[model samples]
Target: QGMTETISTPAATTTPDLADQQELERRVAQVVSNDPQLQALLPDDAVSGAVNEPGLTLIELIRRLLEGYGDRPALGQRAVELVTDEHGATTVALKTEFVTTSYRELWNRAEAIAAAWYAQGIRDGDFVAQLGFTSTDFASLDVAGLRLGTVSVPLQTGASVQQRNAILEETQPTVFAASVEYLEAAVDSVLATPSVQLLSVFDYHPEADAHRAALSAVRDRLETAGRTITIDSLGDAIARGRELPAAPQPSEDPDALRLLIYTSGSTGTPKGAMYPQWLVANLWQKKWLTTTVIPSVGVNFMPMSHLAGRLTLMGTLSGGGTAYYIASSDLSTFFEDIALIRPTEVLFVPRVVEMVFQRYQAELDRSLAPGESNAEIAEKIKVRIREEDFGGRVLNAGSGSAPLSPEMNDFMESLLQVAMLDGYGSTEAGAVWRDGVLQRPPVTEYKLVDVPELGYFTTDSPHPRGELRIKSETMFPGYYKRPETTADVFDEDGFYMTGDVVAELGPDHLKYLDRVKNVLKLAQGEFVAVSKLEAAYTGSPLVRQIFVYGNSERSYLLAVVVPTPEALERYADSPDALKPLIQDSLQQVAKGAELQSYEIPRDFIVETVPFTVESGLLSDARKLLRPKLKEHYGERLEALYAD
Candidate 1:
């Protein structure tokens, strides 16, 4: 009844004043005059709205998005279910049809959720931990936290439980929002932790028996534990809060901490990277980091916990565009979802390209005729992959996180008919280097310092090879509550020490060499310190010499281990028997140290051969030369990744 009397303000971008509109029209007209291909497309109405005001906060940006794109579909998801067959087996399946939530409805729900947080005594800067796949409810929770001035702590659903627990301990969030599938895993932790008083489950379908039973089971566990922590569905919470009095208002503080993007680094330590409200708000001020106006309608398969996923979702919405989440979290329906979405924008990683190519290669070889040329074969396969697999319409796309190899990049660009980007940066820094050229706007300044320990110097021949450090507009202030670690990442002059080895070909032209600390970013964007893991495993009684190895094309690490005398004694002389024994020791170390699953070596070759100076595997100082190690075991380690 009160909806008609509700107060509102039009978006600054959408509904400018008469002078502002005139100025916008004049600006648009300036770029359209000279010999354009399509003069009919130059109408003023086609491109409405101007850039937002300079100092608007992130919450303000959200309000504008709600009023501006109120009637449009904001977030889209395909209908999925647990389908039971004749044999009584069930599996999650996605329907072809997609459903969406309008912007107005989404904002209303978020507002109610904000009221709930207020009613429950949540306030400014209090932590709100989220654990779920990318769902509409999860997105709403983020917006709700933004509205109520709560700091959002999003955990990767696929991350190890120990890793997530460490973050929860550090952040100490009162409300734990998890999906039904993952709620059970957090029950014990929630009960034990004194800080968390509410367990908010999202993606809880009341009509589905599986969803219903899962929530019920979580409640039963909580009851059994004698912890009277409140358990409620997000849907229910929002509905109940709708009738309650609104207390806590939308946040206006631009510099307040909004997000803790925890990155499990090369050392397996989860560092919470802080994203202040101003930073989050200002990311929308520019026309994306690349300044491209490509349509933002796209499918997001990446976890919301990652920077890429966050940008893909936020970037789409900032421009009043649609972002469709992939139907399944496991990515089994990724190709199908891509075809359905037919996305105009894509932010890719190397692993996804490799996955597409593997399937393409399978068909291209079999469908080939004896007389077919190389180009003709590629043409057939590229069409199938581009159209059926990658969704034909990809106007703008780029790849980051890890550099793509020439072969991988070429195949991807060929399929999409767009130059998929190769760049270098970290989760904390956005777009420092693009196409091996300095992105001078986002990265206002950069310099290289001599890495004496690694023998890299500015005085080196050909080009200066040293660490690349930079100050960027989008760089994080520092990691959350990690001042000691934060102190370690920055230099004396306040530049973020990127830990990258770069070759300065010219002033603006730089090429990525390697990490100063020998680390590998795996295909899935995990940074692994082979040296640290090697040291850990070497201290074990079973391993005398070990080299942990991985590349951007693979998710897991492979190893070559020289078994100790005791290990060889325990097992037979055969390589197969010794390998398992060594792995058991590695597992024990991983468990004792609480290392991630990816940190453990997937497989290993039991090396009876010794690594010595004579073999070129060791330096004169008895250090294992990484280049020499790779030369000896690279072929064998790669065999373990696939074979």
Candidate 2:
């Protein structure tokens, strides 16, 4: 190797002396003081600090948390008393009797699972893949990963085999855990992933012969794979762990990667979003500890794979409140559960809320006495819903994961006497603070950039609106192992390209307009916001669900409408009988939205089958799968435009 010599800059002889530099600094300060905008633009912390109080430092925040419960364990480790049924067993908060476990019992089981995972050669930073529905078993495994510092990756229970294979390949988890139901369905795909060495099953009823048979099939498949894949039940894992020595407690690291949550990926392959331990812990603290209003009981039916689901569950556990993990498969049973659980707070997507409202209205209509005023009926129904359905303790009801139109929000709020809030966020960025409207959080900065393809610019006259870009401390670093894709999303200025179009409402408020990619310009050069149009149109009494589409080659929009069953019944045996009725209703909705003539759908085809996750037309999150929809209805949509 050649010898290296240091290269250094020579002392600067032409530079200003100390006295001269101080004079220059004073001149620059004088100039800065003269410009009001420039002075205002300077950071508040850098100013004289007369008008603003400094934000809390990390140490100060941690000290405050310690002061509340001095010398106690962190929220995750802290244990609380669990409710019990009459027979001394833990009470069921959800559907299954076996799901009942005391917090101490849950922690003990989690420790056991962690010990088993460690004994199986899974260590910190290893991936623990889970395929399951919402239950205590899933929560236990999540807690196990938290205790052991392993990354828990939960796959969607409804995902196709190919989608499951792709996710498994991407993460390559050492432990492939499943519920008996999902294991039976995904065993073939699971065996195909070479990285999975151990298989564990949970959330199965021992009395079910079908479950036993499913496990047998999985064992057979593992044998066929020609690998010594260790198979065990969650109970077995806990038993084995009990025989081993307790694992040493490791120090918590705020920046360590803990969870990998995959996006719904309605349009493409799902990407996993990695979260640091501190972010998860801190978010729970803010959601539960910082809030004064407390819910007695919360009902959660959303799948734990979703970000909203996990956050809701964490709020329940961390807040020392009861959470019912009720199954959401059957809406009838879901309504029954609501009546039984009497939740103080409830969260759902817009679709679920709409369904509940329809049912509530139908019940009220059926029960109305012959001579009673409709106003009297409405008041009575609202009171019944408050007392019987929501337990008269509901503090708030809200929607998340997707947009809820103002009309629908107003309807729900009127019925419940509480505001129906919608939260805005993505897997990349945690939820933005909102108060009836989306607002920029103090911790994040944003910019609206011009999107020329859609003719949107931040410099627009009346109100500046364009594609939103965000810079936030809470945002995920990037997609795992997708460096090129990650690099494409961020700019040199460190702002994340949100890919969402929004209009500035005021100082910090933002009104979401449309997806930058989903907005379409017709041949007549008028742009259509498909999401906004669909949401607004769905509120019409004539339509139950609608998907609006526009072709660049066409001058107007066309819709594939799913008419309400009641409307279909009203005009039975006559396809065109209700066209005028629907047309009039749609026009009124369009007027309410203040939409342009070109934005309204010129024609529509009513299809009976509602879009669902199982139909291959919707994602797990219930978002429209545009690619699949296009393929399914291409000819029909094209025919509508023909002469």
Candidate 3:
């Protein structure tokens, strides 16, 4: 809207438009599916219109699309490290280390997992559940499910007993792959489902009789119910799927159901989003996006139940890159994984960022004593970190899967000398809206249009803010079975409506405002984007976690804070004690003539309850459930913000 005169740097490479590639691939897939053998292996209802859309089988997808060498050699040793539960069993590990399997190996494994399902009377287009907690098996199941044309439903590992029971009951999956410990932990809670067959991933007694005991316990019960058959590993399944001759490659159509992942049921009840093979294939086979993340080694920390983690693993596989996993129990081990792996880039949710910040600040404060000056503290923290752990330099750090306060973003960027990029996407929508980065360009076009039959929505300025809807070839298939919900999001013209409230500051720079529904209204009639205020408050290095309150009639935005180690040293002495530091910072920062009144958070709630995903405060997709958090902790937040 302002001055439009500027020279833009030309793109270095010519990548195919994602939309065009998907269009062509859709046609190719249609042609490939016409073979009767392939058709039999696929859903009859799959879209069969064109051959341009060539769907790659699990093996073919990895071979044709996801090929590359990523840079994480620094952290290579820990790339395949395994972590165990309290039982000292391998609960978490990578499928393979460093070198990936040949195309034959990849195909053989997929067929194997598929064969296991076939032996259990699983047919094409059936919904096969991948149960148990998060592990490499779940990921392996993902590949197997795709191979058999079955929908892979990822059940959360950390779900509460009741939450877990409800999902198992709802999905009613015929077979599940679960960890030995996780099964022992939840066996009694989920025993009523007579049709469900459970497989303990750790079935052998190599470690001890632990696996055997767990299997025997569940088997005795299942045998009583007349459904006893416990097994281990996809290799067993592969042997069974091979009992019949290898079926031809299935159709690669977009409409065929590929996977179904349930929402964590945290918000009311869990809902399943049914995805199509075409969309899954598009994500795996995108020739354009490969350039952005391919040749880039993935640093994995999130669980397999998470879509981001799933995307990270397969994304690495598809790009012919490595998936560096860190399965450690303590902070020391976790950092050790990073130091050992030395991944070029990685993404984190807000909680992880906060943890890193808290840890970093603590280390810095220990080095910089009470008598240190501002410059001294800053220099010492940077020097210590550089001297110890960080090697070369972190190329790019990302804050996503949750809201990253701008202050945290700035702090990370300043600390690492690497741009902190934030991405906005959903489990249902896939990834979209790239913001919070350096080197933003303005030649990008953002058109205004009517959404969901609502009146015309337009960006007020070149920096337009509204629902961010873009036509991308990476768009997802509509939500499974929820036609009305799908229709509500997808337009008749084929545009996928992103319900996020968005604002564009520059041509290509879009700031995520908030969810339209999640935006809270203050009693003063002012609508507050909690995320925006959080960014500003956390922008200060003193804060670790900042939650801004929108209480009615409050003179200023109230924030609940978790202080950084630097703040703790200068102000707070007690670990859980937050009152004195927050109040002092507010008064001192307010005295500065350069600061605005609104900039000084008049109230702050010192958060002692650490924000964690396992705590149910965060969604599996990495977004905050403000209502629940606020409802439970509002008193603490209010008290901190009080006089």
Against the hidden reference, what TM-scores do the models get? 0.74, 0.81, 0.74
> What C-alpha lDDT, on a 0 to 100 scale, does residue 300 get in candidate 1?
75
RMSD of every prediction: 13.7, 13.5, 9.9
- Among these predictions, the greatest lDDT belongs to 1
Model 1: clashing residue pairs?
none
What lDDT does candidate 1 reach at residue 507? 68
Best by TM-score: 2
What local distance difference test score does each model get? 0.71, 0.68, 0.55
Please identify which of the two predictions, 2 or 3, would achieve the higher lDDT against the true structure.
2
Give the Å error, residue 270, model 1. 1.2
Q: Which tens-of-lDDT digit does each residue in 1-643 have in candidate 1?
A: 1232223312211222354445534433443343242132221222124337456567766777676666677788998777877876566666897888877888889999888877877777789888777878888998888888888888766455676777888888888888886777767568656688788889777666677778888888888878767887899889998998875665677668988887654465678899888776654444344424444566677766767777678777766667889876666788888888777678776445545655665566567687988679879888877777766666567776654555566777788876676656677877676667666556767789997766678999989978899888788888999899998888899899887788888765687766676867777777665655765676555666677888779888888888755557667656567666677889998887677999998888778776764454653223456776787788878777778
Residues 365-385 of candidate 2: C-alpha lDDT, one tens digit per residue: 577787888778877887887
Q: What's the C-alpha lDDT at position 576 in model 1?
A: 64
TM-score of 1: 0.74
Error of 2 at 34 (Å): 62
